[PDB]
UniProtKB/Swiss-Prot annotation:
Known partners and oligomeric status: Monomer. Interacts with the human antimicrobial peptide LL-37.
Its biological purpose: Major glucan 1,3-beta-glucosidase required for cell wall integrity. Beta-glucanases participate in the metabolism of beta-glucan, the main structural component of the cell wall. Can also function biosynthetically as a transglycosylase. Functions to deliver glucan from the cell to the extracellular matrix. Does not appear to impact cell wall glucan content of biofilm cells, nor is it necessary for filamentation or biofilm formation. Involved in cell-substrate and cell-cell adhesion. Adhesion to host-cell surfaces is the first critical step during mucosal infection.
UniProt GO BP: adhesion of symbiont to host cell; cell-substrate adhesion; fungal-type cell wall organization; glucan catabolic process; glucan metabolic process; single-species biofilm formation in or on host organism; single-species biofilm formation on inanimate substrate
Upper taxonomic lineage: Eukaryota, Fungi, Dikarya, Ascomycota, Saccharomycotina
SUPFAM superfamilies membership: (Trans)glycosidases (SSF51445)
Disruption phenotype: Leads to enhanced susceptibility to the commonly used antifungal, fluconazole, during biofilm growth only.
Protein name: Glucan 1,3-beta-glucosidase
């Protein structure tokens, strides 16, 4: 991959190897007692634990074997995409003592790498969940825990990375894998950043020490633009390093409160800021969402800030009419198309973009398929109904 000249146009294969209740609510809904959600497992840790090893494996094997298949990779290619980001949890490689997680993801990851090769699609392998959790998000596997830097969890994470490095950073997949992402979304504000930097450095060095020339992808840990400019630099002989920035405008009341023009201005400025940075950078996660209305987006048994139903947030608008894309107002469809186009322009201004995510069961703001089929995601992805919203130079 030419990170200097080529632009990544990609989708995440989210909800596949790490369960996210909002992406596959059908796997979590059976635990409901009518309208009471207090008994629904909040993450994959608790879901596998509640089910037990046998049931969890049965249900996950059906999920893994159907959620993403070769046909998805064909459709991805057909739609003009050239890339997928593949989240995977540490537990696919290594279990902590007493971990309830079941394994078997690796078989499908490797099928995926073959399907990518067959369809001329490049790949990041993304270690999306670390033992103890690096962020307390349900998508780390373990909600509301922040223990990645406690005990032996960082070392276990590095051991899992070494496994990933040896299997996937070598010659076998040199034509497919164009990045290994050390850790998805470490929650910088609650972590020791010096230790996180040392972890990134250890990972970088470990990978190169294997003889691998695979790009090392470091997530920005929610730091300000430019924060990583002086870390892992060619000045220190540290090369083939890409910063992965994630961008949304839905996870606080203040962001949700913005009018569409201001949402677009924020998206444009993501582009301007990224352009100033020293490392190659890619927007590895973003979506069309202008609300946090998707059921369980904030987590199982948590409502949406958009309708004043979470975290003492005040009401902004009703979520029910936004759950089904067939029901959207023309205003929301227009706002969505404008927002997607602004983001595309912003992200192609540097290394490109990786939409979160390829598919969801019924959350349209978060599905490349659904948005495309409804004419809201440009197809071809270069199509613009709202050209030059940002005025890039
Ligand atoms: O200031 N911060 O550092 C910060 C970090 C994160 C943040 O929002 C979190 O952001 C997390 C991650 O953002 C997206 O959240 C989506 C829904 O969980 C995931 O599917 C996407 O892959 C992911 O990129 C959310 O999971 C979580 O619910 C939400 O509270 C807000 C502020
Ligand atoms: O600065 C942009 C890029 O320059 C390349 O020569 C380096 O190998 C990368 O690590 C870096 O991100």
């Amino acid at each position: 991959w030419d990170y200097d000249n080529n632009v990544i146009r990609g989708v995440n294969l989210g909800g596949w190897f790490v369960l996210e209740p909002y992406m596959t609510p059908s796997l979590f809904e059976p635990f409901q007692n009518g309208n009471d959600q207090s008994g629904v497992p909040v993450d994959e840790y608790h879901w596998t634990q509640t089910l037990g090893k046998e049931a969890a494996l049965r249900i996950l094997q059906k999920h893994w074997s159907t959620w993403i298949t070769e046909q998805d990779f064909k459709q991805i290619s057909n739609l003009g995409l050239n890339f997928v980001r593949i989240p995977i949890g540490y537990w696919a490689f290594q279990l902590l003592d007493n971990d309830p997680y079941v394994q078997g993801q690796v078989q499908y990851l490797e099928k995926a790498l073959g399907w990518a090769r067959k369809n001329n699609i490049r790949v990041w392998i993304d270690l999306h969940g670390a033992p103890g959790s690096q962020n307390g998000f349900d998508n780390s596997g373990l909600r509301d825990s922040y223990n990645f830097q406690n005990g032996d969890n960082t070392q276990v994470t590095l051991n899992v990375l070494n496994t990933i490095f040896k299997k996937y950073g070598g010659n076998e997949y040199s034509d497919v894998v164009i990045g290994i992402e050390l850790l998805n979304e470490p929650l910088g504000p609650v972590l020791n950043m010096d230790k996180l930097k040392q972890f990134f450095l250890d990972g970088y060095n470990s990978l190169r020490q294997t003889g691998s020339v695979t790009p090392v992808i470091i997530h920005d840990a929610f730091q300000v633009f430019g924060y990583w400019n002086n870390f892992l630099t060619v000045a220190e002989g540290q090369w083939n390093v890409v910063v992965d920035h994630h961008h949304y405008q839905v996870f606080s009341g203040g962001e949700l409160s913005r009018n569409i023009n201001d949402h677009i201005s924020v998206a444009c400025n993501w582009g301007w800021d990224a352009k100033k940075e020293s490392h190659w950078n890619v927007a590895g996660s973003w979506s069309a969402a202008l609300t946090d209305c998707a059921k369980w987006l904030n987590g199982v048994n948590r409502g949406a800030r958009y309708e004043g139903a979470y975290d003492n947030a005040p009401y902004i608008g009703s979520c029910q009419p936004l759950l089904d894309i067939s029901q959207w107002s023309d205003e929301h469809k227009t706002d969505t198309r404008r927002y997607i186009e602004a983001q595309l322009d912003a992200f192609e201004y540097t290394g490109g973009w990786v939409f979160w995510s390829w598919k969801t069961e019924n959350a349209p703001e978060w599905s490349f398929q659904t948005l495309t089929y409804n004419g809201l995601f440009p197809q071809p992805v270069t199509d613009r109904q709202f050209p030059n919203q940002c005025g890039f130079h």
